[PDB]
């Protein structure tokens, strides 16, 4: 009713330990959510076409052209790690657990409050806020997944990461099919390469509305809404990283001479002439057995074209790759392709007391070693006569198509039946948690945005909207926009996300890497003297595991 | 109560498939409804008499004279296809179903909100809107059908067709008996033809009031009202059209010579002299057997006087006809009589962002071929001596009564015991769905406004009205109008309309006509960049069926 | 064994239809000539993601 609360605030994280070294992790998250009435009550079909940017030759990667349906609804999205875990919980999980299973997800809305704004227009302007006891909040749960899946973490538009900071939902919109052609060019390209927005293909038209597809609940101040528990069916997520490349698989060569003194100058030696060695190689016309040429069971990782842009009906898009560059761990400047870069605002980790629209950014450098170092690649002739002469070798410094800045590694692909790789690591706090699986006949082996992929279904998207609060002068047959009482809503959101994790064991004599507070990062985890908070990113696959 | 919702919004359409190829179609429709208090609380008896228009000789078809009772009540009418189906649902129904049965209808009112308007009269005028927690909405359901039946679709005044667009009811009024004489004239008629409103016949007086005939429910903000389910008893509606005229019934003549090469010049020939043929004709004094003269089982369609205006006690009215003109399908300009013309506003399909009072209009051209082409008719003498001479034939170009613009087809009637015809097709979105049957001893074989006709009864009309909100200065013995607090109501309406449809079968080698989105009509089914919507009309009897 | 399609969107979808242009692809000629022109099979869209 008017004066009775309809729910409870809970933002605790409970670790319930089982037998056999498993733990149930139930993350409770609660937020005060602020929602204004939509700018307009109508669905819009809006085309964006930044021709000015792409009209500059060589700027085709800056294409923003697209068509989207703008809806009056707002999306409540909790699909991001920072929503559910503070840094202490994350430290516990990543330091003490070896794998993580996504179990269930629940959410509810309670203590709904709706208010109207009255502006007096007095010479000193002033306004007052009145409770609208009979106004309603419209809530729709797309449990059948009829609406397009639009996870907000990819735009950094989920619920905020601070329990004591009120947050907002994000205005909902989804892609509307369009055709677009963009011929690539470079600086010094003569003329205007074709840069055209062709319109919409009628056979691909899909205009979705919430009202026609989803039951809509009207919540007054005394009402509440609960989704019920959803249970996931995803694969487990490892909290360890592999380090073994092809060079560290299997039995090392026997060393016939071992160092007799310590130091960095005292190496061992195999002690057998390279073409007089025993073992197996896939090179049937050579006698050289070396660490480079010896047969390995399969290939860890794969090379892919990097900063390749493929074009389809909707225009160019970057070719995604499964794993980040090799050597980025030793030199952060070499992260580049496959190392996800996250940009986010003050709701999601940026120091809350900073000013300006510039976001906080970081590039995630995963601990796993499944990537490539293209400067170390080469192709050489089948004859394999060593030392290889210039004409019999293709080096990463050899131009392709006459371009000094492009080599064969830029267009190289070694993905095959022997390729082995890992799933993407969780990115705390900004990374997405779960993602819907594509509805294609043949599905990708993984996603690059979330560790957990929903095979059959995962929870319906939650949509909210302030119900129209008409004045006395409404006229439906009038073309002009509806005249509404300025109305906004504050409601409380509570979610429960349950995981199942396995406690790690100590397999080696040595200790392993562990997340730790220290003198340098100390003040990333406590408020400033004026209450400024931040959440810096954390790694998740600290402990190694043996690949083979 | 004040802070508790009393219902749920639902605008989904569910198709539940049965055994034997039948489907239950349940259309859920929900609307926010805006209602101001009535202009006056009194019933009025108002006479309209546009003498200025009809005083012009030859304008008698423009007569608007009538008497009506103007009531303080408002009618909530959902009897129109656009209220229940969006274009996608309609496409599914008309492309995949062969017949449609009207099953049941339910409706309810919930989340009632009543507000008052306070105008400050400050030098910059301003107003504020307060909830009247104790005000009431008066709701009356004429389940016994005591009130006159006034379906709003004929005035294009039903609930709107957009779930996300708030709508309004229509002020209720009904006809009050009057006597009126209007002698027809033409331009150049001398003098003033008698054009008189005679008043009211006392034995025909019927003054209905809601309060004396219907229980009235007072709904406060915490109250709701449900009608209960009404079950129809109407005939099924076909979703196929017949094409066979009299000329395509039964066995065609045997062709004794068939074409030996393809092309439009290579016809077949019957190969028997016309007066030497075998078969049956109704022309007992001729030996000519032709496709025109051969006996057919009955007559498909009938000729009727067109733009005939008959006069009765209340003045002239146009003679209705069952089916539209023949040849209108090939040439839209020849639609004319029997092809219903719909005019409607921005609630009911007109582009919502257009401006001006000019309505959107279309003429429905039915696919059925039961009409007539009067320019092809003729009458000739019983002697039937061919080729018929001028004096022995009456042609559509022969003047009647000396008028060059009037021929015998204008006054012709071929309705008889051999006449066969079809029911009117559904008109999406603006067409009426169901209609009440006349209370005459002898009933019409069909209605021209709705495919489904209620034999015994169909649902009671739903009436709403803001209850009087008196100031402190009310004086019943004062002749001046009641002084009321400016009060209006917003309530939510939800209806459930259930159909039963049969899945169509493929009877022929060839495919049939099907409703489809294409490059030309593509943008009729999606919002504009500023949220403008429209609903264009659709046909409903696309697939053919064999008549005989 | 086939599943009946549902209408997921406000708009109608593409549908195979006889029209004035393709009409005579589906009936015999005056000398009995027949043809069978190809047809598409994935007319209705579905959301990938």
Tab-separated table of N, CA, C and O in Angstrom, chain A residues 1-2 41-46 69 118-121 131-134 136 138 176 200-203 205 207 209 211-223 467-474 476-479 482 485, chain B residues 1-5 8-9 11-12 32 34 36 86 110-113 115 117 127-129 131 133 163-168 221 346-347 352-355 488 490 492 517-519 522-523 525-531 533:
chain	number	residue	atom	x	y	z
A	1	UNK	N	0.824	-1.243	0.000
A	1	UNK	CA	0.000	0.000	0.000
A	1	UNK	C	0.837	1.263	0.000
A	1	UNK	O	2.055	1.212	-0.176
A	2	UNK	N	0.179	2.403	0.218
A	2	UNK	CA	0.862	3.694	0.127
A	2	UNK	C	2.011	3.763	1.126
A	2	UNK	O	3.134	4.152	0.784
A	41	UNK	N	6.473	9.385	-26.507
A	41	UNK	CA	5.801	8.108	-26.322
A	41	UNK	C	5.851	7.228	-27.564
A	41	UNK	O	5.415	6.074	-27.501
A	42	UNK	N	6.376	7.732	-28.674
A	42	UNK	CA	6.309	7.044	-29.953
A	42	UNK	C	7.591	6.272	-30.234
A	42	UNK	O	8.682	6.653	-29.802
A	43	UNK	N	7.442	5.171	-30.962
A	43	UNK	CA	8.590	4.522	-31.576
A	43	UNK	C	9.048	5.329	-32.784
A	43	UNK	O	8.234	5.791	-33.586
A	44	UNK	N	10.358	5.513	-32.904
A	44	UNK	CA	10.954	6.207	-34.037
A	44	UNK	C	11.876	5.260	-34.788
A	44	UNK	O	12.477	4.361	-34.194
A	45	UNK	N	11.983	5.471	-36.094
A	45	UNK	CA	12.957	4.786	-36.935
A	45	UNK	C	13.951	5.837	-37.415
A	45	UNK	O	13.622	6.665	-38.269
A	46	UNK	N	15.159	5.807	-36.864
A	46	UNK	CA	16.131	6.879	-37.036
A	46	UNK	C	17.341	6.334	-37.777
A	46	UNK	O	17.842	5.252	-37.451
A	69	UNK	N	15.648	1.518	-34.268
A	69	UNK	CA	14.342	1.875	-33.733
A	69	UNK	C	14.553	2.452	-32.340
A	69	UNK	O	15.098	1.781	-31.459
A	118	UNK	N	6.056	20.395	-10.473
A	118	UNK	CA	5.286	21.610	-10.698
A	118	UNK	C	6.235	22.798	-10.648
A	118	UNK	O	6.876	23.040	-9.621
A	119	UNK	N	6.322	23.533	-11.751
A	119	UNK	CA	7.158	24.724	-11.846
A	119	UNK	C	6.258	25.947	-11.739
A	119	UNK	O	5.299	26.085	-12.504
A	120	UNK	N	6.571	26.831	-10.789
A	120	UNK	CA	5.681	27.942	-10.473
A	120	UNK	C	5.735	29.055	-11.512
A	120	UNK	O	4.731	29.743	-11.723
A	121	UNK	N	6.883	29.251	-12.162
A	121	UNK	CA	7.103	30.356	-13.095
A	121	UNK	C	7.155	31.704	-12.385
A	121	UNK	O	7.102	32.756	-13.032
A	131	UNK	N	4.070	13.727	-4.698
A	131	UNK	CA	3.831	12.314	-4.953
A	131	UNK	C	2.560	12.143	-5.773
A	131	UNK	O	1.530	12.754	-5.478
A	132	UNK	N	2.641	11.322	-6.816
A	132	UNK	CA	1.471	10.937	-7.603
A	132	UNK	C	1.086	9.537	-7.143
A	132	UNK	O	1.570	8.533	-7.663
A	133	UNK	N	0.207	9.479	-6.142
A	133	UNK	CA	-0.111	8.210	-5.499
A	133	UNK	C	-0.801	7.235	-6.443
A	133	UNK	O	-0.738	6.024	-6.212
A	134	UNK	N	-1.448	7.724	-7.500
A	134	UNK	CA	-2.175	6.857	-8.417
A	134	UNK	C	-1.454	6.637	-9.742
A	134	UNK	O	-1.951	5.871	-10.571
A	136	UNK	N	1.461	5.140	-12.312
A	136	UNK	CA	1.917	3.768	-12.475
A	136	UNK	C	3.267	3.727	-13.176
A	136	UNK	O	3.599	4.597	-13.983
A	138	UNK	N	5.291	1.193	-15.695
A	138	UNK	CA	5.062	0.057	-16.578
A	138	UNK	C	6.316	-0.803	-16.642
A	138	UNK	O	7.403	-0.312	-16.952
A	176	UNK	N	17.757	-1.609	-36.763
A	176	UNK	CA	16.793	-1.795	-37.837
A	176	UNK	C	17.564	-1.978	-39.136
A	176	UNK	O	18.474	-1.199	-39.430
A	200	UNK	N	16.470	0.322	-46.841
A	200	UNK	CA	16.109	-0.884	-46.109
A	200	UNK	C	15.590	-1.951	-47.065
A	200	UNK	O	14.818	-1.657	-47.981
A	201	UNK	N	16.019	-3.184	-46.839
A	201	UNK	CA	15.522	-4.323	-47.603
A	201	UNK	C	14.179	-4.769	-47.032
A	201	UNK	O	14.115	-5.135	-45.852
A	202	UNK	N	13.093	-4.755	-47.810
A	202	UNK	CA	11.778	-5.071	-47.225
A	202	UNK	C	11.695	-6.448	-46.592
A	202	UNK	O	10.999	-6.609	-45.583
A	203	UNK	N	12.376	-7.451	-47.147
A	203	UNK	CA	12.286	-8.795	-46.593
A	203	UNK	C	13.010	-8.931	-45.259
A	203	UNK	O	12.857	-9.962	-44.597
A	205	UNK	N	12.706	-6.474	-42.809
A	205	UNK	CA	12.107	-5.497	-41.905
A	205	UNK	C	11.556	-6.211	-40.678
A	205	UNK	O	10.800	-7.183	-40.792
A	207	UNK	N	9.943	-4.666	-37.148
A	207	UNK	CA	9.559	-3.591	-36.233
A	207	UNK	C	8.957	-4.227	-34.985
A	207	UNK	O	7.821	-4.704	-35.002
A	209	UNK	N	7.627	-3.991	-31.050
A	209	UNK	CA	7.100	-3.141	-29.995
A	209	UNK	C	6.943	-3.971	-28.731
A	209	UNK	O	6.608	-5.158	-28.785
A	211	UNK	N	4.674	-3.477	-26.409
A	211	UNK	CA	3.267	-3.660	-26.068
A	211	UNK	C	2.653	-4.854	-26.788
A	211	UNK	O	1.772	-5.519	-26.235
A	212	UNK	N	3.097	-5.141	-28.013
A	212	UNK	CA	2.514	-6.232	-28.785
A	212	UNK	C	3.121	-7.590	-28.463
A	212	UNK	O	2.553	-8.612	-28.861
A	213	UNK	N	4.246	-7.635	-27.750
A	213	UNK	CA	4.977	-8.880	-27.549
A	213	UNK	C	5.109	-9.306	-26.096
A	213	UNK	O	5.299	-10.494	-25.837
A	214	UNK	N	5.009	-8.383	-25.145
A	214	UNK	CA	5.315	-8.687	-23.748
A	214	UNK	C	4.148	-8.272	-22.860
A	214	UNK	O	3.593	-7.181	-23.048
A	215	UNK	N	3.747	-9.085	-21.882
A	215	UNK	CA	2.798	-8.590	-20.878
A	215	UNK	C	3.413	-7.424	-20.121
A	215	UNK	O	4.603	-7.433	-19.800
A	216	UNK	N	2.599	-6.416	-19.837
A	216	UNK	CA	3.065	-5.186	-19.208
A	216	UNK	C	2.382	-5.058	-17.855
A	216	UNK	O	1.149	-5.038	-17.770
A	217	UNK	N	3.184	-4.960	-16.801
A	217	UNK	CA	2.652	-4.777	-15.461
A	217	UNK	C	2.649	-3.301	-15.098
A	217	UNK	O	3.642	-2.595	-15.292
A	218	UNK	N	1.519	-2.834	-14.582
A	218	UNK	CA	1.397	-1.484	-14.056
A	218	UNK	C	1.621	-1.546	-12.553
A	218	UNK	O	0.868	-2.215	-11.839
A	219	UNK	N	2.664	-0.876	-12.081
A	219	UNK	CA	3.005	-0.858	-10.665
A	219	UNK	C	2.683	0.515	-10.103
A	219	UNK	O	3.245	1.519	-10.550
A	220	UNK	N	1.787	0.554	-9.124
A	220	UNK	CA	1.602	1.751	-8.326
A	220	UNK	C	2.552	1.704	-7.130
A	220	UNK	O	3.318	0.753	-6.950
A	221	UNK	N	2.509	2.744	-6.297
A	221	UNK	CA	3.497	2.862	-5.230
A	221	UNK	C	3.468	1.662	-4.291
A	221	UNK	O	4.492	1.330	-3.684
A	222	UNK	N	2.322	0.999	-4.157
A	222	UNK	CA	2.221	-0.162	-3.298
A	222	UNK	C	2.521	-1.491	-3.953
A	222	UNK	O	2.434	-2.529	-3.291
A	223	UNK	N	2.880	-1.500	-5.232
A	223	UNK	CA	3.067	-2.730	-5.987
A	223	UNK	C	4.546	-3.090	-6.091
A	223	UNK	O	5.435	-2.257	-5.904
A	467	UNK	N	4.356	5.411	-17.023
A	467	UNK	CA	3.099	5.428	-17.751
A	467	UNK	C	2.714	6.867	-18.094
A	467	UNK	O	3.010	7.793	-17.335
A	468	UNK	N	2.056	7.088	-19.233
A	468	UNK	CA	1.659	8.459	-19.597
A	468	UNK	C	0.748	9.068	-18.543
A	468	UNK	O	-0.223	8.451	-18.102
A	469	UNK	N	1.070	10.295	-18.145
A	469	UNK	CA	0.314	11.047	-17.147
A	469	UNK	C	-0.288	12.257	-17.857
A	469	UNK	O	0.298	13.337	-17.903
A	470	UNK	N	-1.480	12.063	-18.413
A	470	UNK	CA	-2.074	13.064	-19.289
A	470	UNK	C	-2.578	14.269	-18.507
A	470	UNK	O	-2.997	14.154	-17.352
A	471	UNK	N	-2.533	15.432	-19.150
A	471	UNK	CA	-3.268	16.584	-18.662
A	471	UNK	C	-4.730	16.464	-19.090
A	471	UNK	O	-5.149	15.475	-19.697
A	472	UNK	N	-5.517	17.491	-18.768
A	472	UNK	CA	-6.938	17.455	-19.095
A	472	UNK	C	-7.210	17.765	-20.564
A	472	UNK	O	-8.352	17.623	-21.010
A	473	UNK	N	-6.193	18.162	-21.327
A	473	UNK	CA	-6.375	18.664	-22.682
A	473	UNK	C	-5.897	17.692	-23.759
A	473	UNK	O	-5.594	18.125	-24.874
A	474	UNK	N	-5.837	16.396	-23.466
A	474	UNK	CA	-5.346	15.437	-24.449
A	474	UNK	C	-6.287	15.346	-25.645
A	474	UNK	O	-7.511	15.371	-25.499
A	476	UNK	N	-6.212	12.839	-29.005
A	476	UNK	CA	-5.493	11.825	-29.792
A	476	UNK	C	-5.420	12.144	-31.273
A	476	UNK	O	-4.425	11.794	-31.918
A	477	UNK	N	-6.436	12.796	-31.834
A	477	UNK	CA	-6.454	13.115	-33.255
A	477	UNK	C	-5.566	14.300	-33.611
A	477	UNK	O	-5.521	14.687	-34.783
A	478	UNK	N	-4.868	14.887	-32.641
A	478	UNK	CA	-3.948	15.978	-32.918
A	478	UNK	C	-2.572	15.435	-33.282
A	478	UNK	O	-2.043	14.542	-32.612
A	479	UNK	N	-1.989	15.986	-34.349
A	479	UNK	CA	-0.670	15.546	-34.788
A	479	UNK	C	0.429	15.934	-33.809
A	479	UNK	O	1.444	15.235	-33.730
A	482	UNK	N	1.938	14.517	-27.531
A	482	UNK	CA	1.052	14.398	-26.382
A	482	UNK	C	1.484	15.351	-25.272
A	482	UNK	O	2.676	15.482	-24.980
A	485	UNK	N	1.865	15.404	-17.997
A	485	UNK	CA	2.367	15.927	-16.735
A	485	UNK	C	3.790	15.429	-16.534
A	485	UNK	O	4.070	14.231	-16.679
B	1	UNK	N	-6.849	-0.514	-3.907
B	1	UNK	CA	-6.694	0.715	-3.075
B	1	UNK	C	-5.971	1.832	-3.800
B	1	UNK	O	-5.731	1.748	-5.004
B	2	UNK	N	-5.606	2.876	-3.054
B	2	UNK	CA	-5.005	4.062	-3.665
B	2	UNK	C	-3.719	3.694	-4.396
B	2	UNK	O	-3.502	4.087	-5.547
B	3	UNK	N	-2.852	2.928	-3.745
B	3	UNK	CA	-1.541	2.617	-4.277
B	3	UNK	C	-1.374	1.243	-4.889
B	3	UNK	O	-0.234	0.799	-5.056
B	4	UNK	N	-2.459	0.551	-5.228
B	4	UNK	CA	-2.404	-0.815	-5.736
B	4	UNK	C	-3.034	-0.844	-7.120
B	4	UNK	O	-4.132	-0.313	-7.317
B	5	UNK	N	-2.338	-1.456	-8.074
B	5	UNK	CA	-2.887	-1.618	-9.413
B	5	UNK	C	-3.989	-2.670	-9.408
B	5	UNK	O	-3.942	-3.638	-8.646
B	8	UNK	N	-3.781	-5.523	-15.488
B	8	UNK	CA	-2.538	-5.664	-16.232
B	8	UNK	C	-2.755	-5.283	-17.690
B	8	UNK	O	-3.827	-5.521	-18.252
B	9	UNK	N	-1.728	-4.690	-18.291
B	9	UNK	CA	-1.770	-4.340	-19.704
B	9	UNK	C	-1.394	-5.552	-20.553
B	9	UNK	O	-0.368	-6.195	-20.315
B	11	UNK	N	-1.527	-6.557	-24.813
B	11	UNK	CA	-1.888	-6.322	-26.205
B	11	UNK	C	-1.259	-7.374	-27.110
B	11	UNK	O	-0.840	-7.071	-28.227
B	12	UNK	N	-1.188	-8.611	-26.637
B	12	UNK	CA	-0.618	-9.694	-27.421
B	12	UNK	C	-1.706	-10.437	-28.185
B	12	UNK	O	-2.876	-10.445	-27.796
B	32	UNK	N	-4.848	3.021	-22.837
B	32	UNK	CA	-5.081	4.104	-21.893
B	32	UNK	C	-6.154	5.017	-22.475
B	32	UNK	O	-6.038	5.464	-23.620
B	34	UNK	N	-8.640	8.422	-22.113
B	34	UNK	CA	-8.754	9.749	-21.526
B	34	UNK	C	-10.198	10.225	-21.639
B	34	UNK	O	-10.792	10.161	-22.719
B	36	UNK	N	-12.776	13.449	-20.332
B	36	UNK	CA	-13.152	14.667	-19.638
B	36	UNK	C	-14.591	14.558	-19.139
B	36	UNK	O	-15.372	13.727	-19.604
B	86	UNK	N	-2.652	-5.938	-35.380
B	86	UNK	CA	-1.666	-5.186	-36.138
B	86	UNK	C	-1.498	-5.826	-37.513
B	86	UNK	O	-1.990	-6.926	-37.763
B	110	UNK	N	-9.626	-0.725	-15.481
B	110	UNK	CA	-8.782	-0.826	-14.299
B	110	UNK	C	-7.870	0.391	-14.220
B	110	UNK	O	-7.842	1.237	-15.116
B	111	UNK	N	-7.125	0.464	-13.117
B	111	UNK	CA	-6.218	1.574	-12.828
B	111	UNK	C	-6.874	2.916	-13.145
B	111	UNK	O	-6.328	3.761	-13.855
B	112	UNK	N	-8.074	3.101	-12.597
B	112	UNK	CA	-8.791	4.355	-12.780
B	112	UNK	C	-8.068	5.465	-12.035
B	112	UNK	O	-7.677	5.307	-10.871
B	113	UNK	N	-7.883	6.595	-12.707
B	113	UNK	CA	-7.302	7.793	-12.115
B	113	UNK	C	-8.221	8.964	-12.421
B	113	UNK	O	-8.620	9.165	-13.572
B	115	UNK	N	-8.541	13.226	-11.793
B	115	UNK	CA	-7.784	14.418	-11.453
B	115	UNK	C	-8.653	15.653	-11.618
B	115	UNK	O	-9.598	15.670	-12.408
B	117	UNK	N	-8.384	20.055	-12.119
B	117	UNK	CA	-7.534	21.078	-12.712
B	117	UNK	C	-7.765	22.379	-11.960
B	117	UNK	O	-8.894	22.881	-11.903
B	127	UNK	N	-1.598	26.395	-14.370
B	127	UNK	CA	-2.533	25.433	-13.810
B	127	UNK	C	-1.768	24.220	-13.302
B	127	UNK	O	-0.664	23.920	-13.760
B	128	UNK	N	-2.376	23.528	-12.341
B	128	UNK	CA	-1.789	22.342	-11.735
B	128	UNK	C	-2.856	21.259	-11.649
B	128	UNK	O	-4.056	21.541	-11.630
B	129	UNK	N	-2.402	20.011	-11.582
B	129	UNK	CA	-3.270	18.843	-11.662
B	129	UNK	C	-3.135	18.046	-10.371
B	129	UNK	O	-2.042	17.575	-10.037
B	131	UNK	N	-4.643	14.857	-7.856
B	131	UNK	CA	-5.439	13.640	-7.787
B	131	UNK	C	-6.646	13.861	-6.885
B	131	UNK	O	-6.523	14.412	-5.787
B	133	UNK	N	-8.691	11.677	-4.932
B	133	UNK	CA	-8.679	10.294	-4.473
B	133	UNK	C	-10.077	9.759	-4.196
B	133	UNK	O	-10.276	8.541	-4.232
B	163	UNK	N	-1.534	0.432	-29.558
B	163	UNK	CA	-1.452	0.154	-28.113
B	163	UNK	C	-0.707	1.215	-27.319
B	163	UNK	O	-1.041	1.440	-26.150
B	164	UNK	N	0.293	1.867	-27.907
B	164	UNK	CA	1.103	2.850	-27.197
B	164	UNK	C	0.587	4.274	-27.356
B	164	UNK	O	1.250	5.211	-26.904
B	165	UNK	N	-0.570	4.460	-27.987
B	165	UNK	CA	-1.174	5.774	-28.149
B	165	UNK	C	-2.408	5.878	-27.265
B	165	UNK	O	-3.352	5.100	-27.456
B	166	UNK	N	-2.460	6.788	-26.293
B	166	UNK	CA	-3.702	6.955	-25.529
B	166	UNK	C	-4.849	7.353	-26.444
B	166	UNK	O	-4.664	8.049	-27.443
B	167	UNK	N	-6.045	6.887	-26.098
B	167	UNK	CA	-7.232	7.095	-26.912
B	167	UNK	C	-8.329	7.727	-26.063
B	167	UNK	O	-8.143	8.016	-24.879
B	168	UNK	N	-9.477	7.960	-26.688
B	168	UNK	CA	-10.619	8.571	-26.016
B	168	UNK	C	-11.881	7.784	-26.351
B	168	UNK	O	-11.917	7.079	-27.368
B	221	UNK	N	-10.395	5.245	-7.463
B	221	UNK	CA	-9.087	4.913	-8.017
B	221	UNK	C	-8.694	3.470	-7.724
B	221	UNK	O	-7.933	2.870	-8.490
B	346	UNK	N	-6.405	10.325	-37.433
B	346	UNK	CA	-5.079	9.892	-37.009
B	346	UNK	C	-5.124	8.832	-35.915
B	346	UNK	O	-4.091	8.228	-35.614
B	347	UNK	N	-6.288	8.589	-35.315
B	347	UNK	CA	-6.423	7.470	-34.393
B	347	UNK	C	-6.548	6.138	-35.116
B	347	UNK	O	-6.306	5.093	-34.504
B	352	UNK	N	-0.007	9.779	-38.393
B	352	UNK	CA	-0.272	10.519	-37.164
B	352	UNK	C	0.394	11.888	-37.145
B	352	UNK	O	-0.047	12.765	-36.395
B	353	UNK	N	1.439	12.096	-37.941
B	353	UNK	CA	2.152	13.365	-37.960
B	353	UNK	C	1.621	14.333	-39.009
B	353	UNK	O	2.149	15.442	-39.127
B	354	UNK	N	0.597	13.952	-39.767
B	354	UNK	CA	-0.021	14.899	-40.680
B	354	UNK	C	-0.790	15.959	-39.898
B	354	UNK	O	-1.111	15.794	-38.718
B	355	UNK	N	-1.079	17.063	-40.576
B	355	UNK	CA	-1.811	18.172	-39.989
B	355	UNK	C	-3.015	18.490	-40.862
B	355	UNK	O	-3.069	18.125	-42.038
B	488	UNK	N	-11.343	15.308	-14.780
B	488	UNK	CA	-11.194	14.372	-15.883
B	488	UNK	C	-10.602	13.082	-15.342
B	488	UNK	O	-10.037	13.046	-14.246
B	490	UNK	N	-8.456	9.325	-16.314
B	490	UNK	CA	-7.686	8.423	-17.154
B	490	UNK	C	-7.823	7.019	-16.586
B	490	UNK	O	-7.522	6.790	-15.409
B	492	UNK	N	-7.520	2.594	-17.732
B	492	UNK	CA	-7.002	1.609	-18.666
B	492	UNK	C	-8.116	0.655	-19.066
B	492	UNK	O	-8.859	0.163	-18.211
B	517	UNK	N	4.802	-7.868	-47.750
B	517	UNK	CA	5.578	-6.635	-47.745
B	517	UNK	C	6.473	-6.603	-48.975
B	517	UNK	O	7.006	-7.634	-49.406
B	518	UNK	N	6.634	-5.418	-49.558
B	518	UNK	CA	7.490	-5.244	-50.722
B	518	UNK	C	8.127	-3.863	-50.663
B	518	UNK	O	7.909	-3.094	-49.723
B	519	UNK	N	8.921	-3.554	-51.690
B	519	UNK	CA	9.689	-2.311	-51.693
B	519	UNK	C	8.771	-1.095	-51.732
B	519	UNK	O	9.140	-0.017	-51.253
B	522	UNK	N	6.694	-0.942	-48.122
B	522	UNK	CA	7.541	-1.265	-46.979
B	522	UNK	C	7.363	-0.287	-45.821
B	522	UNK	O	7.211	-0.697	-44.666
B	523	UNK	N	7.366	1.010	-46.110
B	523	UNK	CA	7.331	2.024	-45.064
B	523	UNK	C	5.916	2.363	-44.601
B	523	UNK	O	5.744	3.344	-43.873
B	525	UNK	N	4.463	0.140	-42.719
B	525	UNK	CA	4.373	-0.755	-41.574
B	525	UNK	C	5.433	-0.475	-40.517
B	525	UNK	O	5.627	-1.297	-39.617
B	526	UNK	N	6.127	0.656	-40.609
B	526	UNK	CA	7.147	1.026	-39.627
B	526	UNK	C	7.031	2.508	-39.323
B	526	UNK	O	6.558	3.300	-40.147
B	527	UNK	N	7.457	2.915	-38.130
B	527	UNK	CA	7.351	4.330	-37.762
B	527	UNK	C	8.318	5.202	-38.550
B	527	UNK	O	9.356	4.745	-39.033
B	528	UNK	N	7.957	6.476	-38.679
B	528	UNK	CA	8.836	7.452	-39.304
B	528	UNK	C	9.911	7.905	-38.317
B	528	UNK	O	9.911	7.542	-37.137
B	529	UNK	N	10.845	8.720	-38.815
B	529	UNK	CA	11.955	9.163	-37.981
B	529	UNK	C	11.502	10.068	-36.842
B	529	UNK	O	12.256	10.260	-35.883
B	530	UNK	N	10.298	10.630	-36.920
B	530	UNK	CA	9.735	11.405	-35.822
B	530	UNK	C	8.606	10.644	-35.123
B	530	UNK	O	7.818	11.243	-34.396
B	531	UNK	N	8.522	9.332	-35.328
B	531	UNK	CA	7.525	8.530	-34.648
B	531	UNK	C	6.168	8.482	-35.309
B	531	UNK	O	5.212	8.010	-34.691
B	533	UNK	N	3.171	7.104	-37.344
B	533	UNK	CA	2.652	5.794	-37.705
B	533	UNK	C	1.430	5.925	-38.605
B	533	UNK	O	0.736	6.945	-38.604
